[PDB]
UniProtKB/Swiss-Prot annotation:
Descriptive protein name: Endoglucanase E-5
Reaction(s) catalysed (UniProt annotation): Endohydrolysis of (1->4)-beta-D-glucosidic linkages in cellulose, lichenin and cereal beta-D-glucans
Catalytic residues identified in the record: 138, 230
Source species: Thermobifida fusca
GO biological process assignments: cellulose catabolic process
Enzyme class of the recorded protein, top EC level: hydrolase
Family listed: Belongs to the glycosyl hydrolase 5 (cellulase A) family.
EC number: 3.2.1.4
Keyword rRNA-binding: no
GO molecular function, a single term: polysaccharide binding
Keywords from the named record: Carbohydrate metabolism, Cellulose degradation, Glycosidase, Hydrolase, Polysaccharide degradation, Signal
Pathway noted in the entry: Glycan metabolism; cellulose degradation
Annotated gene: celE
Length: 305
């Protein structure tokens, strides 16, 4: 069976994400890059490869709002997201719908848009059991209390239409559980989002983010459910040299704690973190072998187990 067939209607159980029979499950896969730039990398061929060859459990659909994203054509971007959600579902993948805020870093800047978009997505896809909603990719420059209040504004819009879906909430300091802004996950545990079936996002880039980030992820996983919706093996820019030794420490921790992840990213961007070599997408593949950057071969090998 496909991942979706094997785990069914995933839900939070205690501090973990579980399958529909209460067994903790670790969903591993890939994040797209921004669909405003790398839409051409998401085709029948490339998505079939991700599902059937790479054996990904899950795909995160990253939709930037600024940076030539959603705000430039809400209707067109929404229609493409519907199409991609259906395509992922027709390949047996879980899907994270990623409201990819970054700059501006205050999620409230995009709240009115987020309510409109998520209302449409949740209504259309309410009958699906494989869709998770990521309501604010990388909050930055804002307090945890303000992220919590943002979450409490958006969550009811989704839950009104799709009550039984998992929502992933971004965290302080580019979703570093506060680590990058001098804090940590204890702040969240002391003042959690007042909803259940919630997970909290953590992002890391292994060449830049060492033991203090790894420790924070371990710490958080004791207190609440974490999903690593974005990570890289290189520096925090998504480029530079890989540190696979450090990355493997994160991978081993996530496997031990059944923390799901989606690696940045499934595109042929020039940066080392994009799994394909520039030109691969225009060439229609191949989606393996000589078209993979080092980080690409590394993650494909992890996913194939
Ligand atoms: Na980025
Ligand atoms: Zn196909
Ligand atoms: Zn541009
Ligand atoms: Zn539902
Ligand atoms: Zn990011």
């Amino acid at each position: 069976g496909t991942p979706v067939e094997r785990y069914g209607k995933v839900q939070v159980c205690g501090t973990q994400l579980c399958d529909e029979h209460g067994n903790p499950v670790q969903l591993r896969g890939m994040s797209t890059h921004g669909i405003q730039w790398f839409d051409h990398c998401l085709t029948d061929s490339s998505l079939d490869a991700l599902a059937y060859d790479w054996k990904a459990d899950i795909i995160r659909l990253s939709m930037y709002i600024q940076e030539d994203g959603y705000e430039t054509n809400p209707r067109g971007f929404t229609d493409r997201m519907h199409q991609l959600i259906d395509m992922a579902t027709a390949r047996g993948l879980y899907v994270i719908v990623d409201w990819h805020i970054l700059t501006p870093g205050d999620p409230h800047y995009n709240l009115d848009r987020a309510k409109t978009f998520f209302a449409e997505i949740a209504q259309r896809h309410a009958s699906k059991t494989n869709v998770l909603y990521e309501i604010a990719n990388e909050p930055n420059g804002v307090s945890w209390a303000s992220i919590k209040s943002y979450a409490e504004e958006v969550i009811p819009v989704i839950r009104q239409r799709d009550p039984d879906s998992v929502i992933i909430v971004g965290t302080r300091g580019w979703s570093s559980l506060g680590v990058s802004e001098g804090s940590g996950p204890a702040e969240i545990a002391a003042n959690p989002v007042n909803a259940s079936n919630i997970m909290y996002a953590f992002h890391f880039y292994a060449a830049s983010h060492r033991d203090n980030y790894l420790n924070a992820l371990r710490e958080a996983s004791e207190l609440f459910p974490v999903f690593v919706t974005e990570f890289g093996t290189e520096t925090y820019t998504g480029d530079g040299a890989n540190d696979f030794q450090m990355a493997d420490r994160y991978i081993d921790l996530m496997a031990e704690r059944k923390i799901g992840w989606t690696k940045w990213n499934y595109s042929d961007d020039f940066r080392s973190g994009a799994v394909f070599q520039p030109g691969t997408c225009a060439s229609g593949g191949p989606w393996s072998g000589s078209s993979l950057k080092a980080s690409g071969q590394w993650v494909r090998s992890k996913l194939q187990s």
